[PDB]
Amino acid sequence: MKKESINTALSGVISAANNADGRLEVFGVGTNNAVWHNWQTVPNTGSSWSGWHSLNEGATSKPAVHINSDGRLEVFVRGTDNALWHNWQTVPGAGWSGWQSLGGQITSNPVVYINSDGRLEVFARGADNALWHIWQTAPHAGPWSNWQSLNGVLTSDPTVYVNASGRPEVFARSNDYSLWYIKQTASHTYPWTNWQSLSGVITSNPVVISNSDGRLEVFARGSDNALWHIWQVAPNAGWTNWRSLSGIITSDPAVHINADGRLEVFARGPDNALWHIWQTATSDAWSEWTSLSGVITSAPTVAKNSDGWLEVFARGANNALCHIQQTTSSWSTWTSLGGNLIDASAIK
Numbered sequence: 001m002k003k004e005s006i007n008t009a010l011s012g013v014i015s016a017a018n019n020a021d022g023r024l025e026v027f028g029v030g031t032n033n034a035v036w037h038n039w040q041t042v043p044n045t046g047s048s049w050s051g052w053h054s055l056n057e058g059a060t061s062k063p064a065v066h067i068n069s070d071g072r073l074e075v076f077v078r079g080t081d082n083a084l085w086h087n088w089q090t091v092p093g094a095g096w097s098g099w100q101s102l103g104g105q106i107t108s109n110p111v112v113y114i115n116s117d118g119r120l121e122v123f124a125r126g127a128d129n130a131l132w133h134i135w136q137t138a139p140h141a142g143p144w145s146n147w148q149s150l151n152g153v154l155t156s157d158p159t160v161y162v163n164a165s166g167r168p169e170v171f172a173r174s175n176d177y178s179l180w181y182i183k184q185t186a187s188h189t190y191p192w193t194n195w196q197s198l199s200g201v202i203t204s205n206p207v208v209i210s211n212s213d214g215r216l217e218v219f220a221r222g223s224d225n226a227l228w229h230i231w232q233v234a235p236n237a238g239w240t241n242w243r244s245l246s247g248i249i250t251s252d253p254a255v256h257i258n259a260d261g262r263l264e265v266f267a268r269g270p271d272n273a274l275w276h277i278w279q280t281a282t283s284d285a286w287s288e289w290t291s292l293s294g295v296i297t298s299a300p301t302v303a304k305n306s307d308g309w310l311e312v313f314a315r316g317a318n319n320a321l322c323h324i325q326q327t328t329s330s331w332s333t334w335t336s337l338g339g340n341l342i343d344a345s346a347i348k
């Protein structure tokens with residue numbers, strides 16, 4: 001992006017969260033363009049699922065869900081008016097409010113962050129291709145703020161994570177195909193930094209996560225269709241250069257931190273199987289690319305159950321939601337959670 005703007009692959013087809021009681025719940029767009037959801041029924045290891053239930057209305061983005069600091073799930077999606085809409089549990093685990101508009105005009109999928117004080121905050125690309133944000137004005141409560149611009153020129157969904165100083169950093173691809181980012185500070189006069197380049201040539205949505213020690217790390221597909229990554233050399237310090245983890249990935253990458261405190265990345269491979277690769281140590285050590293097989297037609301979505309094990313979801317050949325999970329001793333078989341999912345991604 002130019003100076004004027006610096007002053008402040010297949011996507012996944014679901015968003016997942018844990019309920020206050022640990023139960024996983026997934027949100028996706030069905031063939032009728034409505035948001036549907038499906039949850040674990042019991043706050044218990046080895047739970048069955050509910051089956052798909054409709055939240056009605058009309059979705060034009062991938063949905064995003066985040067738990068409030070009072071335990072209530074809240075889901076966000078772009079509506080047919082290209083405004084941001086939301087719907088929340090009125091008590092932890094049940095009783096959806098129904099959809100209400102937060103307005104704006106957004107041109108990416110919305111991503112959700114929770115501030116250290118418990119205020120939800122949503123980041124999305126605007127009609128002017130700048131990053132915009134909107135927030136709860138009180139912990140787990142409306143009203144929401146007006147939309148505010150953070151400038152920039154975005155060509156991807158933004159990706160956000162809390163840094164070692166408890167504040168958000170937001171990363172996005174720009175119109176030079178490089179990764180740029182902004183970081184929130186304590187400063188009154190400059191609460192957000194100006195957009196800063198981390199270079200690279202990126203051909204997927206990027207995804208940021210924290211290592212167990214607070215070092216932020218970003219994953220993205222490169223121009224060679226390999227998985228690339230870049231990380232902080234110490235908590236809240238400067239970044240490495242871009243380093244290749246090789247492979248050929250045919251979706252956005254997904255990442256989580258496993259029970260060993262190691263980052264583990266999932267992506268679709270060129271055989272349409274699910275592949276994963278993980279840190280084997282702190283310093284400069286990853287596993288080989290490893291196949292979990294299956295046949296998938298979306299990026300994977302990774303979540304973590306209340307026993308601390310990773311669960312992975314992806315669209316199957318029949319548009320059902322495929323499912324595979326880490327157990328105490330191995331990876332499970334592939335099972336289907338059914339449904340009929342579309343890719344309503346706003347950034348495609």
Ligand code: NA
Pocket residue numbers: 033034035055056057058059
């Ligand atoms: Na809907």
